[PDB]
């Protein structure tokens, strides 16, 4: 294989000290790892394919001059994308973020029958089309 002499390191991978993040935004943050829910206003499912990581929402207040929404949270907009739940968890662990994982919610397969609309003796008979 390699000509480069490797070493053995059994430490858990932790990069908190070399990321430059302030202490406040490592230990007091909660990361949420989830697959986004489908926007119920539309039938397209293409935004439910990937895993996302977001952070706990913090205060927003009104700017005295204009009424704009101010924030002191540097992570308020950070959203990361991941192929699998395991990739998202691995990223959160090595960055030292506490996290919750929410299992993916796949719609269950349905039994669809057009003929059922015209049942002779069942309640599925439609009164209109």
């Amino acid at each position: 294989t390699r000509d480069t002499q490797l070493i053995t390191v059994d430490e858990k991978l932790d990069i908190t000290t070399i990321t430059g993040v302030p202490e406040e935004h490592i230990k007091t943050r909660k990361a949420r790892i989830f697959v986004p829910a489908r926007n119920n206003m539309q039938s397209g499912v293409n935004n439910t394919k990937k895993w996302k990581m977001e952070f706990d929402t913090r205060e927003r207040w009104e700017n005295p001059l204009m009424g704009w929404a101010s924030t002191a949270d540097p992570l308020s907009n950070l959203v990361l994308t991941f192929s699998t739940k395991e990739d998202a968890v691995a990223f959160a662990e090595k960055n030292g973020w506490s996290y919750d994982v929410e299992e993916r919610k796949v719609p269950k397969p349905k039994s669809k029958s057009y003929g059922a609309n015209f049942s002779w003796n069942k309640r599925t008979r439609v009164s209109t089309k």
């Binding site: 949420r32 989830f34 986004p36 829910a37 489908r38 926007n39 119920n40 206003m41 539309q42 039938s43 397209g44 499912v45 293409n46 706990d56 929402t57 913090r58 205060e59 927003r60 207040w61 009104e62 704009w68 929404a69 506490s98 919750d100 929410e102 299992e103 919610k105 719609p107 269950k108 397969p109 349905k110 039994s111 669809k112 029958s113 057009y114 059922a116 609309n117 069942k122 309640r123 599925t124 439609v126 009164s127 209109t128 089309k129």
Partner: protein
């Protein structure tokens, strides 16, 4: 071995018989375009947007309705399919109005998006367009029917899901119109859902009109607290303000629906809010103060009272973290008078066994039942999404439903056995003919409403219903794993309080009136100052000034369910948590942090300083409270029934009357909804009228 082999663009997929072409493409991750098809509605096949080419078949088929046949190769991207989509999209847009800038659907419109992905990029329609009159169907759903594409989703939803047959089509051809023909309001507890299913801007939220565009909103996935179903929701916020509530799919709870109160009562969060601590001044009036001063006043009283001199009542919207914090604080002055407004009989097992106060069959288990007996409940209004599940099973599983109580309109036909509670005696003994139907049933389900347990004879009713359930379950007919006895709760905080060892009801407080009363969001008015010693020191903690706050000595502004990460347990015993969508207003604070801060001032510091720590505390009291999205089964029905028969209590003669008889009683049932201006318009509409 019943699966057949079909191909999607040449890739083999094995599907069960009856699978449609559209469902076969789903299995390989290909989403066929659609407008009329909805997987939770009856197939319609009228929009023709799902047309697809079958290899070697000269005619395109409607993928949403065509059953796939063995060996078929579905070409989802052939020129023939693409030309069919372009042709259909062209017809849809010919008469559609140029409304996108003024239409609320813009930015989350399936017509816009499928036009971009599957339609042409230009128009060759050189005529004038159709224009249609608008229909008024109430104060929740705005109609701009010139945008309607006649997909009939709303008609099929109203008929099949909501059980209302007010929507139809009138006329013929290009002038065919969706509506009610006469002037009629589509007032149903599930009406707001026709906004979501409508693919276009024809049906939109009237309260939401013009306020935001979809791309600019932030989505906070959360839980509903308007009832005990625990509907999953998305809270849309923009620049720190709540904008709307949308459903979030959960197959085992609300599917993809929510009730109108869940959808539209959020505007009550902007009114009558408690934003600053308040104390009584020398003139006996509530005046704003600091957190330091308000807590010092409360801490001083708490340090001078012990035992039965201290008590607490928890209202219907309190979270588990706040409940456990208050219980721990009152336990540290050796007080056990931790009460809830909602009664649940303490006779027999009481709250010792979870199975005694849960919906043991679970919401999704209704679809497996073959008989349902409803007792003293109007599920249509107490748990609208649970009632929709019953109608779904009534529709598709031919479920038999019987009701003991007032004959309310459940949106499906049922068997009314009467309203006297003595019928429960007949069914148990076998005298009643319906007793035989339960014995026949393989999977009977008996549901007792928490509202029926507010009667002074609630222990007798629960014993009677449990006697019916146990005579059935421990006998031939039902498997060992099928659970028959169910309680249907209507209060979001009730099950968590029971899990934590609270006393249900305020009988304990009435027996031994206290000198210091904590009202934790308690706005039912069950205990007023006429029931307390003249000098009672009342502390109200909550988010709305309503019933509890006016009579308090100290007001501590807490947060609403949109403003905290809090645990709620639904009627099945499933623990779920909200997420912060916006922070609490003004000086309001997370509710468990108020109690934790109070304990530090009082010299009784609780042993948790973070949310995770107070949740570790929840695990020590009831481990299921931190098992989020899991339903933990509860056993020992026989033991509960043995303790239930020890004391025989006599049923009262008065018939079972649900607190909610008509839709007008549905809209306002808690502090948030009572402050909602939208809910007030709904009450006016159903009472006065459209005028």
């Amino acid at each position: 071995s019943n699966l057949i082999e079909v191909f999607v663009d040449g890739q083999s997929v094995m599907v069960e018989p009856g699978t449609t072409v559209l469902q076969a493409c789903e299995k390989v991750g290909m989403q066929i375009p659609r407008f009329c098809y909805h997987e939770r509605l009856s197939v319609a096949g009228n929009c023709r947007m799902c047309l697809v080419e079958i290899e070697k078949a000269p005619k395109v088929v409607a993928a949403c309705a065509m059953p796939v046949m063995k060996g078929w190769n579905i070409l989802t991207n052939s020129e023939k399919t693409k030309k069919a989509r372009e042709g259909v999209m062209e017809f849809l847009l010919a008469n559609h109005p140029l409304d996108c800038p003024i239409c609320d659907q813009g930015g989350e419109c399936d017509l816009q998006d499928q036009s971009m992905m599957f339609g042409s990029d230009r128009s060759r329609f050189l005529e004038g367009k159709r224009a249609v009159e608008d229909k008024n169907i109430g104060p929740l759903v705005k109609t701009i029917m010139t945008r309607c594409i006649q997909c009939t989703r709303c008609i099929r939803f109203a008929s099949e899901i909501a059980g209302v047959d007010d929507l139809g089509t009138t006329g013929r051809g290009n002038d065919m119109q969706v509506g009610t023909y006469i002037e009629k309001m589509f007032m149903s507890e599930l009406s707001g859902n026709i906004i979501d299913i409508c693919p276009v801007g024809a049906l939109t939220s009237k309260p939401y009109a013009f306020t935001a565009r979809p791309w600019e909103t932030r989505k906070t996935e959360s839980i509903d607290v308007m009832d005990a179903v625990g509907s999953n929701i998305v809270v849309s916020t923009r620049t720190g303000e709540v904008m709307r509530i949308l459903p979030r799919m959960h197959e085992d709870i609300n599917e993809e629906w929510i009730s109108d109160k869940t959808r539209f009562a959020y505007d009550g969060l902007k009114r009558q809010r408690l934003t600053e601590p308040m104390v009584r001044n020398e003139k006996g009036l509530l005046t704003h103060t600091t957190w330091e001063d308000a807590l010092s006043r409360v801490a001083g009283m708490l340090q001078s009272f012990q035992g039965n001199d201290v008590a607490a009542i928890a209202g219907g919207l309190v979270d588990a973290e706040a409940l456990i914090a208050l219980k721990d604080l009152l336990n540290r002055v050796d007080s056990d008078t931790l009460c809830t407004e909602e009664v649940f009989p303490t006779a027999g097992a009481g709250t010792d066994l979870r199975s005694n106060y849960l919906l043991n069959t679970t919401i999704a288990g209704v679809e497996e039942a073959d008989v349902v007996l409803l007792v003293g409940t109007n599920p249509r209004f107490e748990a609208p999404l649970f009632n929709a599940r019953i109608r779904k099973s009534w529709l598709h599983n031919d479920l038999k439903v019987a009701l003991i109580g007032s004959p309310v309109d459940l949106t499906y036909r049922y068997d009314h056995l009467g309203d006297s509670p003595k019928i429960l005696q007949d069914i148990a003994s076998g005298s009643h003919p319906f007793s035989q139907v339960l014995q026949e049933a393989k999977k009977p389900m008996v549901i007792l409403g928490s509202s029926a347990l507010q009667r002074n004879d609630g222990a007798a009713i629960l014993a009677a219903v449990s006697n019916i359930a146990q005579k059935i379950r421990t006998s031939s007919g039902v498997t060992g794993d099928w659970k028959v006895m169910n309680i249907l709760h209507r209060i979001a905080s009730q099950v968590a309080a029971l899990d934590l060892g609270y006393k249900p009801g305020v009988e304990a407080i009435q027996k031994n009136p206290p000198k210091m009363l904590f009202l934790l969001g308690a706005d039912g008015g069950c205990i007023t100052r006429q029931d307390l010693p003249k000098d009672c020191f009342i502390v109200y903690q909550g988010h709305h000034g309503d019933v509890g706050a006016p009579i308090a000595d100290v007001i501590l502004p807490g947060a609403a369910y949109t403003e905290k990460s809090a645990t709620y347990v639904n009627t099945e015993g499933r623990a779920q948590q909200t997420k912060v969508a916006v922070t609490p207003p003004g000086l309001a604070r997370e509710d468990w942090k108020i109690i934790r801060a109070l304990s530090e001032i009082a010299g009784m510091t609780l042993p948790y300083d973070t949310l995770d720590q107070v949740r570790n505390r929840l695990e020590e009291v009831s481990p299921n409270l931190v098992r989020y999205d899991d339903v933990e089964g509860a056993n020992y029905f026989q033991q509960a029934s043995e303790l239930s028969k020890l004391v025989n209590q006599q049923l009262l003669a008065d018939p079972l009357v649900p607190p909610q008889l008509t839709i007008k009683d549905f809209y306002m049932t808690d502090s948030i909804s009572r402050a909602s201006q939208t809910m007030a318009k709904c009450v006016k509409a159903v009472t006065e009228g459209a005028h």
